[PDB]
């Protein structure tokens, strides 16, 4: 018999996707020579298996390239040589994904997996299919989009402490719609730590912190006054700051207006994208535990705010109850758990 060559691409193909390697296989013989080059003549790196049967590229292949593959197979019964030229995808736009939380981080039981693209995603389904989430112990979860750029993945309930979470965003070479392709792959891995849930009850004006179900801190607080109340519901802890100037314009409200403010504060823990923080409030210690005076923030004492900074971490939970406000929006940024599971699981890929 005469050796047979089989490649993963066909001569004259166009729109060849660069999400996978290019390969060539010999049957009834072995591969004696395999080379691939770009349109400038520069060689593409590859590897031939020890048995001589299978060659594959080993580096990232480029968008908008014309590659030429030359292969020869030799066997007892003869020789075959093939030359194949093909063109890879040519994107209209590129989008880079950014994943949170950080690689190697230990996070609380409320932390969703977040993939944020730097451009609007036309094909949300293609984006979801390209994101591989591994959990150990395994748990069911699902994707939901907060806006046109950001998608989240979480389970039905808060995570179990000790769970490993691996996130592979395999978007390089993937058409995310209207010719927007992934700029690159991204990968993160995190772990869930202890269960920490802090409850602010407007009936008592106390912020109680529980760690694995035990009360460890009871903080008198002053939440949003009646005209600018703090919303009820489940908030995920985000960033923390030793000090920060809180600027209402950051959150939609001009400083100079009736509910605007610009205020330098210490020991600030962010709990909503709408600009709710737990923070130090020396001016309101008299009202804390008694009356609501703020713009929405959970005002506590300097030592309590510092304690919160030190002992609460990204992905821990604050639950507000019994205020005169509404409910925090599910799509706030840190309001994900306010979306009922049936609705979340259904998704919004479109």
Swiss-Prot record:
Null mutant phenotype: Inactivation of this gene leads to altered colony morphology and growth, attenuation of persistence and increased susceptibility to amoxicillin-clavulanate both in vitro and in the mouse model during the chronic phase of infection. Loss of both ldtMt1 and ldtMt2 results in phenotypes that are unique and/or severe compared to the single mutants lacking only ldtMt1 or ldtMt2.
Transmembrane parts of this sequence: none
Membrane topology type: Lipid-anchor
Binding positions for Ca(2+) per the UniProt entry: 175, 178-179
Chief subcellular location: membrane
Activity regulation: Is irreversibly inactivated by the beta-lactams carbapenems via the formation of a covalent adduct resulting from acylation of the catalytic Cys.
Full protein name: L,D-transpeptidase 2
């Amino acid at each position: 018999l005469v050796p047979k060559l089989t490649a993963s691409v066909t001569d004259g193909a166009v729109g060849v996707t660069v999400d996978a390697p290019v390969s060539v296989t010999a049957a009834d013989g072995v591969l004696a020579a395999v080379t691939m080059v770009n349109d400038n003549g520069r060689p593409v790196a590859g590897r031939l298996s020890p048995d001589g049967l299978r060659w594959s590229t080993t580096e990232q292949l480029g968008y908008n390239r014309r590659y030429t593959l030359n292969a020869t197979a030799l066997g007892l019964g003869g020789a075959a040589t093939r030359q194949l030229t093909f063109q890879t995808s040519s994107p209209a736009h590129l989008t880079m994904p950014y994943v949170m939380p950080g690689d190697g981080e230990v996070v609380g039981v409320g932390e969703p997996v977040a993939i944020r693209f730097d451009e609007n995603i036309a094909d949300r389904g293609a984006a979801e299919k390209a994101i591989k989430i591994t959990t150990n112990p395994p748990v069911e979860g699902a994707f939901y989009w907060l806006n046109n750029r950001e998608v989240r993945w979480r389970p039905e309930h808060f995570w179990k402490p000790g769970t490993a979470v691996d996130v592979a965003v395999n978007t390089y070479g993937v058409d995310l719609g209207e010719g927007m392709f992934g700029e690159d792959n991204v990968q993160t891995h995190f772990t869930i730590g202890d269960e920490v849930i802090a409850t602010a009850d407007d009936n008592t004006k106390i912020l109680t912190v529980r760690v694995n179900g035990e009360v460890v801190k009871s903080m008198p607080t002053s939440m949003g006054k009646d005209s600018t109340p703090t919303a009820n519901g489940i908030y995920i802890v985000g960033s923390r700051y030793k000090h920060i100037i809180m600027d209402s314009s950051t959150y939609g409200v001009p400083v100079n207006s009736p509910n605007g403010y610009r205020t330098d504060v210490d020991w600030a823990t962010q709990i909503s994208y709408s600009g709710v923080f737990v923070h130090s409030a020396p001016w309101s210690v008299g009202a804390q535990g008694h009356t609501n005076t703020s713009h929405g923030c959970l005002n506590v004492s300097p030592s309590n705010a510092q304690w919160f900074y030190d002992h609460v971490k990204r992905g821990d939970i604050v639950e507000v109850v019994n205020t005169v406000g509404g409910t925090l929006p599910g799509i706030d940024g840190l309001g994900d758990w306010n979306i009922p599971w049936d609705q979340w699981r259904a998704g919004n890929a479109k």
